[PDB]
Amino acid sequence: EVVVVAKFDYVAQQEQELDIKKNERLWLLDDSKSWWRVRNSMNKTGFVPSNYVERK
């Protein structure tokens, strides 16, 4: 039930990463490391840089 909002665009460079756009809302799934695992509104998941998203 935790939301993050992207602060910057991120174009994925590996299969496990996720493309995000600035202002996109995402579900936060795992915040244990410096890259966080998120789910988007297309029901896709992947890792993004934790400093590119803001916990709401």
């Binding site: 490391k33 410096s34 890259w35 695992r37 934790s50 400093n51 590119y52």
Partner: peptide, 9 residues
């Protein structure tokens, strides 16, 4: 914008 952290996922 800042650099990404070193990936360790």
């Amino acid at each position: 914008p800042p650099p990404v952290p070193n990936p360790d996922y």
